[PDB]
Ligand binder design. Structure first.
Ligand SMILES: Cc1ccc(-c2ncccc2OCc2ccccn2)cc1
Length: 261
């Protein structure tokens, strides 16, 4: 547990939500570290605790690191600061970013997901809004509130909450089954979002209308300026049958090779 005397919080919020607010802060460790703090009904407790318990077990450069928990006037989840914030919003305001720079960022997301897959964790909310930027050339995965550590004997989680259908693979909607392969579908949508400079996927459509579109074999089109090799990867991520769909090892490899070629 973190010491409240060591934590200094800035006045205004970086953002907010149902849970509460996200404030900037500084945690004294001789070297003072800049931090992001999630500040908050036992439902919110269990969700912040479960997110904390997932982040504790993770150690990778492309996944936001947890510093610790601080009980004070409220419950606080103190993390590394991704100063530039949500990838979608960043791109919504910076169209100068080249396609080579976007490939670097999505590849970095695929490396973080390669590690999550090997660690047998499922994210279940992979979207451009949850990829936070440290610098313009350094992204990290965030928001582990819906994430699940898979049991040693199974390859998926069977869900019984939040329901972002537009990032969800068919097996999730039909059978409520979430695996690393489901995250790969979400990653595909995430790439589309990145190459469309933060625009929303399937705009104007209801969840049921997205499901019908996909069940007809229809997919989203190629965003303006998006390379062909990257668009062919999106479609590979959106393989309907979970068996034929690639894992993050094959997805990460595909992004690595094209980036350096
Ligand atoms: C829900 C939410 C997420 C991110 C922000 C945010 N916005 C603008 C600049 C920075 C931001 O947050 C950086 C951050 C947060 C959590 C862990 C690491 N880094 C605000 C609200």
């Amino acid at each position: 547990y973190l010491d409240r005397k060591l934590l200094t919080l800035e006045d205004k919020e970086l953002g907010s939500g149902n849970f509460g607010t996200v404030k900037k802060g500084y945690y004294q460790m001789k070297v003072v570290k800049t931090v992001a703090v999630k500040i908050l009904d036992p439902a919110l407790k269990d969700e912040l605790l479960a997110e904390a318990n997932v982040m504790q077990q993770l150690d990778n450069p492309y996944i936001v690191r947890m510093i610790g928990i601080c009980e004070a006037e409220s419950w606080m989840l103190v993390m590394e600061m991704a100063e530039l914030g949500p990838l979608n919003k960043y791109l919504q305001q910076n169209r100068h970013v080249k396609d080579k720079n976007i490939i670097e960022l999505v590849h970095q997301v695929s490396m973080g997901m390669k590690y999550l897959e090997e660690s047998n964790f499922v994210h279940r909310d992979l979207a451009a809004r949850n990829v936070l930027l440290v610098t313009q050339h350094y992204a990290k995965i965030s928001d582990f509130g819906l994430s699940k550590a898979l049991r040693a004997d199974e390859n998926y989680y069977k869900a019984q909450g939040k329901w972002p259908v537009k990032w969800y693979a068919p097996e999730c909607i039909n059978y409520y089954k979430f695996s690393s392969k489901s995250d790969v579908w979400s990653f595909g949508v995430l790439m589309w979002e990145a190459f469309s400079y933060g625009q929303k996927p399937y705009r104007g459509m209801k969840g049921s209308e997205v499901t019908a579109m996909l069940e007809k074999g229809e997919r989203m089109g190629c965003p303006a300026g998006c390379p062909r090799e990257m668009y062919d990867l999106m479609n590979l991520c959106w393989t309907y049958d979970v068996e034929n769909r690639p894992g993050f090892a094959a997805v990460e490899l595909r992004l690595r090779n094209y980036y350096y070629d």
